[PDB]
Amino acid sequence: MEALVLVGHGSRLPYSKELLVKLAEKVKERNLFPIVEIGLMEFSEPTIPQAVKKAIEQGAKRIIVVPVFLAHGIHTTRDIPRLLGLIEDKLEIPEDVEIIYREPIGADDRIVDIIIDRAFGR
Amino acid sequence: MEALVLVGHGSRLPYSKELLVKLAEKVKERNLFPIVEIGLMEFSEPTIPQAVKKAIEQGAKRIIVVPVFLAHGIHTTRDIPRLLGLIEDKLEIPEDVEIIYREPIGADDRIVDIIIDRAFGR
Ligand SMILES: [Co+2]
Ligand SMILES: [Co+2]
């Protein structure tokens, strides 16, 4: 009834989409979501609209879209809410489904923990 | 003797550099590093070279540079190593100081925890 769609920048190198894929798999393994899909903004497949439609086609009524970005970028505040038709302006139209657009990662202490670890080659 | 330099994309919007700033402050208050500086790749001050030199000027011999990026981008594999002169090609020259260039965040379970939380409006 609810879908989780992870959404990432995308890049010409594969690291970006590998990342979303591993993250998808780890949340699949937590057994918390009925449906879980990923979508890259640019130059990769699947795209956000594909991912969103791919979630409706499994019968989600509420789609939770989580931008896997650290900071609030232009992408997180113009392009993606556009793609989702949450802001008036390659568009995707859903039928009596609500898209729920979440917050990015931000300065979460868990990041600092990761950062600290990363400093020490851990 | 060792400096921690956090390093971020940077953007025309301020969110990016705010992020690095908050992260700097949180690791400052873990009391783990003698010196801690931040630096943005593009658009913002301070820049990476500024941040690196700013760390040498406090008498670091070993600078730990941690790329606060989720994925491995072009920026993490060409531009930043270039800026640090770790790869042959606004150059920075250090004197008999070693720069230690760490790994980015990647698909760390703590990210998934953050992601899961983020889905639930938390
Ligand atoms: Co972009
Ligand atoms: Co860039």
Side-chain angles (χ1 to χ4, degrees), chain B residues 19-109:
Chain B
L19 206 231
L20 277 256
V21 158
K22 231 136 304 141
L23 294 179
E25 288 167 343
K26 317 201 146 197
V27 329
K28 260 173 254 140
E29 72 188 64
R30 298 292 181 89
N31 303 274
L32 302 180
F33 290 91
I35 293 155
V36 163
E37 225 81 63
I38 64 144
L40 293 306
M41 234 211 94
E42 301 165 352
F43 299 127
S44 284
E45 262 199 28
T47 67
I48 290 162
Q50 281 172 321
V52 160
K53 96 199 168 195
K54 198 190 165 187
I56 309 198
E57 84 190 22
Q58 327 198 224
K61 296 266 126 211
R62 215 162 92 264
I63 311 118
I64 310 319
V65 177
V66 181
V68 185
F69 296 67
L70 292 184
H72 258 300
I74 322 71
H75 309 289
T76 72
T77 54
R78 230 207 322 97
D79 317 3
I80 296 178
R82 253 171 206 193
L83 286 153
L84 306 187
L86 259 52
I87 247 91
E88 127 96 21
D89 225 62
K90 303 298 299 223
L91 198 261
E92 182 45 16
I93 27 192
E95 180 104 323
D96 306 27
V97 179
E98 42 162 333
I99 322 143
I100 294 275
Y101 182 44
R102 254 63 160 100
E103 226 63 42
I105 286 147
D108 191 294
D109 299 26

XYZ file of all heavy atoms in Angstrom, chain B residues 19-109:
722
model
N 25.973 22.476 5.990
C 26.172 21.062 6.310
C 27.594 20.786 6.792
O 27.781 20.248 7.891
C 25.925 20.201 5.070
C 25.481 18.755 5.316
C 26.345 17.771 4.542
C 25.485 18.424 6.788
N 28.592 21.083 5.941
C 29.979 20.925 6.355
C 30.227 21.703 7.643
O 31.002 21.296 8.480
C 30.922 21.428 5.262
C 31.240 20.451 4.136
C 32.634 19.888 4.312
C 30.207 19.340 4.050
N 29.584 22.849 7.815
C 29.939 23.625 8.987
C 29.425 22.912 10.225
O 30.166 22.747 11.191
C 29.429 25.065 8.880
C 29.310 25.730 10.243
C 30.352 25.852 7.965
N 28.170 22.459 10.156
C 27.606 21.742 11.283
C 28.439 20.494 11.536
O 28.756 20.180 12.687
C 26.140 21.373 11.044
C 25.184 21.767 12.160
C 23.900 22.390 11.630
C 24.139 23.595 10.737
N 23.198 23.628 9.593
N 28.878 19.818 10.460
C 29.600 18.592 10.712
C 30.930 18.932 11.394
O 31.307 18.294 12.381
C 29.837 17.828 9.414
C 28.620 17.269 8.673
C 29.130 16.571 7.417
C 27.773 16.310 9.516
N 31.639 19.953 10.896
C 32.860 20.398 11.553
C 32.648 20.581 13.055
O 33.439 20.116 13.878
C 33.335 21.677 10.925
N 31.547 21.241 13.413
C 31.330 21.602 14.799
C 31.085 20.349 15.625
O 31.583 20.224 16.748
C 30.169 22.576 14.957
C 30.497 23.964 14.447
C 29.281 24.860 14.293
O 28.141 24.325 14.278
O 29.476 26.088 14.187
N 30.318 19.410 15.090
C 30.048 18.192 15.828
C 31.325 17.384 16.027
O 31.491 16.788 17.089
C 28.921 17.366 15.209
C 27.721 18.178 14.752
C 26.455 17.380 14.630
C 25.265 18.231 14.994
N 24.085 17.381 15.267
N 32.262 17.401 15.072
C 33.447 16.589 15.322
C 34.416 17.347 16.229
O 35.178 16.727 16.964
C 34.137 15.995 14.069
C 33.180 15.698 12.925
C 35.308 16.822 13.586
N 34.395 18.681 16.170
C 35.110 19.510 17.128
C 34.687 19.114 18.547
O 35.536 18.977 19.425
C 34.906 20.994 16.808
C 36.056 21.650 16.056
C 35.785 23.072 15.599
C 35.539 23.160 14.106
N 34.448 24.100 13.750
N 33.384 18.881 18.756
C 32.936 18.637 20.124
C 33.069 17.163 20.514
O 32.691 16.778 21.605
C 31.593 19.299 20.425
C 30.413 18.635 19.759
C 29.129 19.430 19.909
O 29.066 20.558 19.373
O 28.200 18.924 20.568
N 33.662 16.334 19.660
C 33.972 14.979 20.080
C 35.375 14.978 20.689
O 35.821 13.962 21.236
C 33.949 13.970 18.922
C 32.630 13.772 18.196
C 31.542 13.121 18.996
N 30.357 12.965 18.172
C 30.133 11.898 17.411
N 31.031 10.925 17.370
N 29.018 11.818 16.698
N 36.076 16.119 20.544
C 37.432 16.296 21.060
C 38.372 15.167 20.628
O 39.041 14.587 21.478
C 37.429 16.541 22.575
C 36.579 17.739 22.954
O 37.040 18.876 22.935
N 35.324 17.504 23.288
N 38.463 14.904 19.316
C 39.281 13.820 18.800
C 40.420 14.361 17.937
O 41.385 13.634 17.689
C 38.423 12.894 17.941
C 37.214 12.252 18.609
C 36.491 11.362 17.612
C 37.635 11.448 19.819
N 40.292 15.609 17.455
C 41.271 16.119 16.502
C 41.893 17.416 17.006
O 41.215 18.259 17.598
C 40.699 16.211 15.082
C 40.465 14.867 14.443
C 39.240 14.218 14.571
C 41.483 14.232 13.743
C 39.035 12.963 14.012
C 41.282 12.980 13.183
C 40.058 12.354 13.315
N 43.215 17.586 16.764
C 43.919 18.800 17.176
C 43.405 19.979 16.348
O 43.091 21.059 16.845
C 45.372 18.509 16.780
C 45.438 17.010 16.524
C 44.063 16.627 16.037
N 43.281 19.731 15.045
C 42.892 20.754 14.096
C 41.781 20.192 13.222
O 41.882 19.061 12.734
C 44.118 21.131 13.244
C 45.201 21.823 14.078
C 43.727 21.937 12.019
C 46.602 21.678 13.505
N 40.741 20.997 12.992
C 39.682 20.553 12.100
C 39.258 21.692 11.186
O 38.738 22.695 11.657
C 38.485 20.033 12.903
C 37.252 19.978 12.026
C 38.793 18.666 13.488
N 39.360 21.511 9.863
C 38.952 22.561 8.936
C 37.992 22.000 7.885
O 38.028 20.795 7.607
C 40.203 23.007 8.197
C 40.289 24.505 8.128
C 40.838 25.046 9.427
O 41.993 24.704 9.737
O 40.109 25.789 10.119
N 37.172 22.864 7.243
C 36.341 22.462 6.111
C 36.747 23.231 4.852
O 37.358 24.286 4.974
C 34.847 22.699 6.382
C 34.550 24.189 6.549
C 34.365 21.866 7.554
C 33.210 24.610 5.980
N 36.373 22.699 3.682
C 36.682 23.283 2.389
C 35.728 22.763 1.322
O 35.419 21.576 1.326
N 35.218 23.690 0.509
C 34.271 23.353 -0.533
C 34.979 23.343 -1.878
O 35.811 24.207 -2.174
C 33.085 24.317 -0.533
C 32.175 24.241 0.687
C 31.672 22.816 0.917
C 32.889 24.780 1.914
N 34.673 22.324 -2.668
C 35.259 22.226 -3.995
C 34.942 23.456 -4.861
O 35.842 24.190 -5.265
C 34.785 20.951 -4.689
C 35.897 20.086 -5.192
S 35.223 19.273 -6.633
C 35.792 20.426 -7.885
N 33.653 23.736 -5.123
C 33.251 24.830 -5.995
C 32.369 25.836 -5.250
O 31.687 25.495 -4.281
C 32.524 24.318 -7.246
C 33.341 23.370 -8.107
C 32.581 22.546 -9.149
O 31.331 22.567 -9.138
O 33.240 21.863 -9.968
N 32.393 27.084 -5.727
C 31.375 28.093 -5.466
C 31.492 28.747 -4.094
O 30.746 29.675 -3.824
C 29.951 27.524 -5.554
C 29.551 26.957 -6.890
C 29.049 25.668 -6.993
C 29.642 27.712 -8.053
C 28.668 25.146 -8.225
C 29.277 27.183 -9.286
C 28.792 25.900 -9.374
N 32.328 28.251 -3.189
C 32.129 28.662 -1.816
C 33.487 28.849 -1.184
O 34.495 28.454 -1.758
C 31.284 27.670 -1.069
O 29.918 27.811 -1.443
N 33.471 29.513 -0.040
C 34.676 29.660 0.743
C 34.438 29.052 2.117
O 33.303 29.037 2.609
C 35.204 31.093 0.747
C 36.308 31.291 -0.274
C 37.174 32.514 -0.039
O 37.302 32.934 1.140
O 37.722 33.043 -1.034
N 35.500 28.478 2.732
C 36.816 28.355 2.092
C 36.887 27.208 1.089
O 36.038 26.311 1.109
C 37.755 28.041 3.263
C 36.882 27.338 4.268
C 35.505 27.948 4.100
N 37.899 27.245 0.215
C 38.159 26.203 -0.759
C 39.046 25.145 -0.121
O 39.625 25.377 0.946
C 38.888 26.763 -1.983
O 40.202 27.170 -1.587
C 38.126 27.906 -2.615
N 39.198 24.024 -0.828
C 40.053 22.938 -0.362
C 41.495 23.423 -0.151
O 42.078 23.272 0.938
C 39.954 21.712 -1.299
C 38.590 21.023 -1.186
C 41.093 20.734 -1.074
C 38.273 20.123 -2.358
N 42.154 24.034 -1.164
C 43.525 24.504 -0.959
C 43.636 25.457 0.233
O 44.570 25.350 1.040
C 43.908 25.120 -2.311
C 42.591 25.428 -2.980
C 41.632 24.357 -2.502
N 42.683 26.384 0.353
C 42.665 27.283 1.507
C 42.670 26.501 2.822
O 43.392 26.876 3.752
C 41.415 28.162 1.492
C 41.509 29.335 0.534
C 40.181 30.037 0.437
O 39.113 29.421 0.418
N 40.246 31.351 0.368
N 41.748 25.524 2.897
C 41.556 24.671 4.056
C 42.820 23.866 4.343
O 43.299 23.863 5.475
C 40.353 23.787 3.867
N 43.402 23.237 3.313
C 44.658 22.524 3.482
C 45.759 23.461 3.989
O 46.398 23.151 5.001
C 45.060 21.763 2.208
C 46.535 21.416 2.169
C 44.219 20.515 2.041
N 45.953 24.624 3.337
C 47.023 25.511 3.769
C 46.724 25.991 5.190
O 47.622 26.035 6.026
C 47.296 26.622 2.746
C 46.604 27.955 3.005
C 46.522 28.869 1.788
C 45.580 30.047 1.979
N 45.233 30.727 0.704
N 45.447 26.277 5.470
C 45.005 26.743 6.770
C 45.317 25.697 7.838
O 45.372 26.015 9.020
C 43.513 27.102 6.764
C 43.066 27.984 7.925
C 41.561 28.159 8.072
C 41.203 28.733 9.430
N 39.739 28.769 9.659
N 45.460 24.435 7.435
C 45.779 23.408 8.408
C 47.290 23.313 8.633
O 47.744 23.140 9.759
C 45.169 22.094 8.000
N 48.074 23.530 7.572
C 49.526 23.546 7.671
C 49.924 24.731 8.541
O 50.797 24.580 9.392
C 50.166 23.613 6.269
C 49.599 22.546 5.332
C 51.676 23.508 6.358
C 50.466 22.288 4.115
N 49.225 25.864 8.406
C 49.593 27.063 9.142
C 49.349 26.881 10.638
O 49.758 27.721 11.410
C 48.807 28.268 8.616
C 47.424 28.392 9.242
C 46.438 29.394 8.656
O 46.598 29.779 7.474
O 45.498 29.780 9.387
N 48.663 25.814 11.047
C 48.543 25.524 12.467
C 49.506 24.394 12.860
O 49.507 23.931 14.005
C 47.087 25.195 12.794
C 46.057 25.946 11.966
C 44.686 25.899 12.622
O 43.659 25.671 11.991
N 44.627 26.119 13.922
N 50.352 23.958 11.920
C 51.436 23.046 12.248
C 51.006 21.579 12.223
O 51.330 20.791 13.111
N 50.239 21.239 11.195
C 49.947 19.853 10.923
C 51.030 19.340 9.992
O 51.512 20.058 9.115
C 48.571 19.685 10.330
N 51.417 18.101 10.252
C 52.346 17.367 9.401
C 51.591 16.292 8.609
O 51.919 15.953 7.459
C 53.438 16.783 10.304
C 54.302 17.815 11.012
C 55.549 18.095 10.207
C 55.755 19.557 9.899
N 56.445 19.706 8.600
N 50.579 15.719 9.250
C 49.720 14.749 8.577
C 48.310 15.324 8.430
O 47.618 15.477 9.433
C 49.648 13.453 9.397
C 49.557 12.183 8.557
C 49.893 10.822 9.164
N 48.699 10.189 9.713
C 48.317 10.241 10.992
N 49.066 10.866 11.884
N 47.197 9.651 11.378
N 47.890 15.612 7.184
C 46.523 16.080 6.962
C 45.616 14.953 6.454
O 45.805 14.422 5.360
C 46.467 17.301 6.024
C 47.456 18.388 6.420
C 45.061 17.849 5.941
C 48.459 18.638 5.338
N 44.576 14.641 7.234
C 43.542 13.683 6.866
C 42.406 14.424 6.169
O 41.707 15.227 6.809
C 43.022 12.967 8.127
C 44.181 12.431 8.965
C 42.018 11.881 7.770
C 45.270 11.817 8.119
N 42.239 14.125 4.876
C 41.207 14.737 4.061
C 40.074 13.732 3.839
O 40.294 12.689 3.223
C 41.796 15.179 2.717
C 40.732 15.753 1.812
C 42.928 16.164 2.909
N 38.880 14.041 4.318
C 37.753 13.141 4.247
C 36.709 13.766 3.333
O 36.176 14.817 3.642
C 37.179 12.915 5.648
C 36.008 11.965 5.624
C 38.265 12.402 6.560
N 36.421 13.128 2.172
C 35.432 13.617 1.220
C 34.049 13.274 1.747
O 33.692 12.099 1.814
C 35.742 12.794 -0.038
C 36.328 11.514 0.490
C 37.164 11.969 1.656
N 33.311 14.310 2.144
C 31.941 14.133 2.601
C 31.020 14.021 1.387
O 30.318 14.981 1.057
C 31.478 15.256 3.557
C 30.080 14.998 4.115
C 32.473 15.511 4.685
N 31.115 12.889 0.686
C 30.263 12.599 -0.454
C 29.738 11.180 -0.264
O 30.413 10.389 0.383
C 31.081 12.622 -1.743
C 31.711 13.931 -2.144
C 32.733 14.493 -1.396
C 31.344 14.553 -3.333
C 33.318 15.692 -1.785
C 31.923 15.752 -3.724
C 32.909 16.320 -2.944
N 28.535 10.896 -0.751
C 28.017 9.555 -0.628
C 28.799 8.629 -1.553
O 29.286 7.610 -1.104
C 26.539 9.566 -1.005
C 25.652 10.314 -0.032
C 24.207 10.155 -0.465
C 25.837 9.791 1.387
N 28.884 8.971 -2.839
C 29.351 8.040 -3.852
C 30.728 8.479 -4.342
O 31.222 9.536 -3.954
C 28.349 7.976 -4.978
N 31.365 7.631 -5.149
C 32.607 8.012 -5.780
C 32.255 8.751 -7.061
O 31.668 8.180 -7.967
C 33.455 6.774 -6.049
C 34.561 6.591 -5.073
N 35.562 7.548 -4.916
C 34.852 5.565 -4.236
C 36.424 7.120 -4.013
N 36.002 5.901 -3.568
N 32.553 10.042 -7.104
C 32.205 10.801 -8.288
C 33.459 11.082 -9.086
O 34.508 10.552 -8.763
N 33.320 11.915 -10.116
C 34.487 12.421 -10.814
C 35.262 13.302 -9.844
O 36.490 13.260 -9.806
C 34.106 13.208 -12.080
C 32.919 12.593 -12.839
C 35.341 13.326 -12.954
C 31.539 12.733 -12.167
N 34.510 14.068 -9.044
C 35.089 15.015 -8.110
C 35.988 14.276 -7.106
O 37.083 14.733 -6.740
C 33.981 15.868 -7.476
C 33.007 16.530 -8.406
N 33.357 17.588 -9.223
C 31.675 16.353 -8.591
C 32.299 18.017 -9.890
N 31.234 17.295 -9.499
N 35.564 13.070 -6.714
C 36.305 12.347 -5.695
C 37.509 11.616 -6.287
O 38.414 11.245 -5.550
C 35.406 11.391 -4.899
O 35.049 10.288 -5.735
C 34.179 12.075 -4.331
N 37.542 11.435 -7.618
C 38.564 10.599 -8.233
C 39.468 11.349 -9.216
O 40.521 10.823 -9.572
C 37.936 9.363 -8.876
O 36.938 9.890 -9.746
C 37.294 8.445 -7.862
N 39.061 12.548 -9.662
C 39.940 13.390 -10.456
C 40.220 14.668 -9.671
O 41.347 14.879 -9.237
C 39.294 13.726 -11.809
C 40.182 13.480 -13.021
C 39.958 14.292 -14.289
N 38.606 14.628 -14.708
C 38.015 15.791 -14.454
N 38.654 16.723 -13.770
N 36.784 16.031 -14.875
N 39.197 15.517 -9.489
C 39.399 16.921 -9.156
C 40.078 17.076 -7.799
O 40.986 17.890 -7.646
C 38.080 17.691 -9.120
C 37.132 17.362 -10.259
O 37.469 16.490 -11.068
O 36.047 17.978 -10.319
N 39.623 16.331 -6.791
C 40.104 16.577 -5.445
C 41.538 16.070 -5.326
O 42.393 16.797 -4.835
C 39.144 16.033 -4.364
C 37.808 16.771 -4.434
C 39.748 16.161 -2.974
C 36.768 16.292 -3.457
N 41.879 14.858 -5.827
C 43.267 14.391 -5.764
C 44.199 15.359 -6.496
O 45.344 15.595 -6.074
C 43.221 13.020 -6.448
C 41.771 12.603 -6.365
C 40.979 13.885 -6.458
N 43.668 15.983 -7.561
C 44.412 16.963 -8.328
C 44.733 18.161 -7.454
O 45.893 18.565 -7.367
C 43.637 17.429 -9.565
C 44.224 16.850 -10.844
C 43.444 17.065 -12.119
N 43.826 15.973 -13.001
C 43.563 15.911 -14.301
N 42.903 16.888 -14.899
N 43.957 14.862 -14.998
N 43.683 18.691 -6.815
C 43.827 19.850 -5.942
C 44.871 19.601 -4.855
O 45.630 20.503 -4.503
C 42.465 20.233 -5.364
C 41.529 20.906 -6.369
C 40.066 20.666 -6.009
C 41.821 22.401 -6.490
N 44.922 18.361 -4.363
C 45.812 17.928 -3.301
C 47.176 17.526 -3.870
O 48.039 17.083 -3.114
C 45.158 16.740 -2.582
C 43.737 16.965 -2.071
C 43.255 15.788 -1.220
C 43.695 18.239 -1.249
N 47.352 17.658 -5.196
C 48.535 17.177 -5.899
C 48.897 15.721 -5.588
O 50.074 15.379 -5.468
N 47.885 14.848 -5.489
C 48.140 13.427 -5.324
C 48.185 12.720 -6.682
O 48.422 11.519 -6.737
C 47.065 12.843 -4.411
C 47.527 12.645 -2.974
C 48.138 13.933 -2.445
C 46.375 12.193 -2.097
N 47.973 13.481 -7.758
C 47.826 12.952 -9.102
C 48.440 14.009 -9.997
O 48.131 15.190 -9.842
C 46.335 12.702 -9.433
C 46.020 11.212 -9.600
C 45.864 13.504 -10.643
C 45.576 10.520 -8.334
N 49.297 13.573 -10.927
C 50.098 14.481 -11.736
C 49.199 15.259 -12.704
O 48.740 14.723 -13.712
C 51.306 13.731 -12.317
C 51.491 13.841 -13.824
C 52.454 14.888 -14.364
O 53.338 15.332 -13.606
O 52.327 15.244 -15.556
N 48.933 16.526 -12.353
C 48.199 17.500 -13.154
C 47.633 18.556 -12.198
O 47.003 19.508 -12.693
C 47.113 16.879 -14.053
C 47.105 17.435 -15.478
O 48.117 17.270 -16.193
O 46.088 18.040 -15.869
N 45.914 26.435 -10.083
C 45.541 26.736 -8.674
C 46.085 25.633 -7.769
O 45.431 25.233 -6.804
C 44.021 26.900 -8.555
C 43.401 27.969 -9.451
C 43.885 29.389 -9.185
C 43.591 29.877 -7.782
N 43.104 31.275 -7.794
N 47.312 25.187 -8.089
C 47.949 24.032 -7.468
C 48.375 24.371 -6.040
O 48.705 25.520 -5.725
C 49.136 23.563 -8.329
C 49.687 22.144 -8.098
C 50.928 22.141 -7.214
C 48.638 21.172 -7.564
N 48.329 23.341 -5.184
C 48.811 23.416 -3.816
C 50.063 22.557 -3.682
O 50.082 21.396 -4.094
C 47.730 22.989 -2.819
C 48.159 23.095 -1.367
C 48.882 24.377 -0.972
O 48.826 25.373 -1.729
O 49.505 24.376 0.092
N 51.099 23.172 -3.104
C 52.362 22.517 -2.805
C 52.557 22.531 -1.285
O 52.521 23.601 -0.677
C 53.517 23.182 -3.595
C 53.220 24.655 -3.926
C 53.831 22.374 -4.850
C 54.154 25.313 -4.936
N 52.662 21.355 -0.607
C 52.996 21.302 0.821
C 54.471 20.988 1.049
O 55.106 20.373 0.197
C 52.160 20.095 1.285
C 52.122 19.151 0.084
C 52.360 20.013 -1.145
N 55.014 21.359 2.212
C 56.409 21.004 2.433
C 56.539 19.820 3.396
O 56.295 19.977 4.590
C 57.222 22.217 2.893
C 58.698 21.909 3.130
C 59.682 22.381 2.072
O 59.347 22.334 0.871
O 60.788 22.803 2.456
N 56.969 18.656 2.870
C 57.313 17.470 3.651
C 56.248 17.220 4.710
O 56.539 16.915 5.869
C 58.712 17.565 4.257
C 59.739 17.857 3.184
O 59.334 18.463 2.169
O 60.915 17.473 3.359
N 55.013 17.415 4.252
C 53.769 17.115 4.927
C 53.129 16.034 4.063
O 53.318 16.038 2.845
C 52.917 18.398 4.984
C 51.578 18.187 5.657
C 53.661 19.528 5.672
N 52.447 15.078 4.696
C 51.759 14.077 3.897
C 50.252 14.303 3.995
O 49.695 14.471 5.077
C 52.190 12.649 4.251
C 52.331 12.399 5.747
C 52.338 10.955 6.241
O 51.749 10.073 5.570
O 52.926 10.711 7.316
N 49.602 14.329 2.826
C 48.153 14.398 2.767
C 47.636 12.966 2.719
O 48.139 12.166 1.946
C 47.688 15.205 1.540
C 48.597 16.403 1.257
C 46.244 15.631 1.726
C 48.801 16.688 -0.215
N 46.650 12.650 3.561
C 46.059 11.323 3.581
C 44.611 11.455 3.115
O 43.808 12.098 3.772
C 46.206 10.692 4.983
C 47.683 10.431 5.314
C 45.321 9.459 5.172
C 48.256 9.118 4.803
N 44.312 10.840 1.965
C 43.034 11.030 1.313
C 42.109 9.837 1.544
O 42.341 8.765 0.994
C 43.254 11.299 -0.170
C 41.983 11.560 -0.934
C 40.982 12.386 -0.444
C 41.810 10.992 -2.179
C 39.834 12.624 -1.182
C 40.675 11.227 -2.930
C 39.681 12.041 -2.429
O 38.574 12.237 -3.199
N 41.042 10.047 2.323
C 40.191 8.951 2.754
C 39.078 8.606 1.757
O 39.012 9.151 0.658
C 39.665 9.234 4.153
C 40.343 8.372 5.203
C 41.808 8.708 5.224
N 42.351 8.262 6.498
C 43.024 7.136 6.677
N 43.246 6.321 5.663
N 43.478 6.828 7.876
N 38.239 7.634 2.144
C 37.218 7.064 1.282
C 35.933 7.841 1.544
O 35.812 8.480 2.573
C 37.117 5.564 1.583
C 37.077 4.673 0.352
C 38.341 4.739 -0.491
O 39.438 4.743 0.108
O 38.230 4.812 -1.743
N 34.960 7.927 0.614
C 33.693 8.567 0.927
C 32.785 7.636 1.718
O 33.173 6.523 2.089
C 33.065 8.832 -0.447
C 33.649 7.776 -1.315
C 35.065 7.564 -0.804
N 31.568 8.134 1.932
C 30.651 7.565 2.899
C 30.258 6.153 2.489
O 30.525 5.220 3.243
C 29.459 8.508 3.149
C 29.926 9.689 4.000
C 28.347 7.775 3.864
C 29.235 10.980 3.715
N 29.606 6.017 1.319
C 29.244 4.724 0.751
C 28.028 4.109 1.434
O 27.359 4.777 2.212
N 27.733 2.839 1.135
C 26.505 2.216 1.624
C 26.741 1.616 2.999
O 26.859 0.403 3.160
C 25.962 1.196 0.645
N 26.845 2.520 3.967
C 27.083 2.179 5.349
C 25.718 2.003 6.005
O 24.783 2.751 5.728
C 28.029 3.243 5.933
C 28.569 2.898 7.274
O 27.694 2.843 8.250
O 29.833 2.778 7.313
N 25.611 0.972 6.838
C 24.341 0.651 7.454
C 23.745 1.856 8.185
O 22.531 2.069 8.151
C 24.446 -0.639 8.256
C 24.828 -1.807 7.366
O 25.468 -1.560 6.324
O 24.471 -2.941 7.714
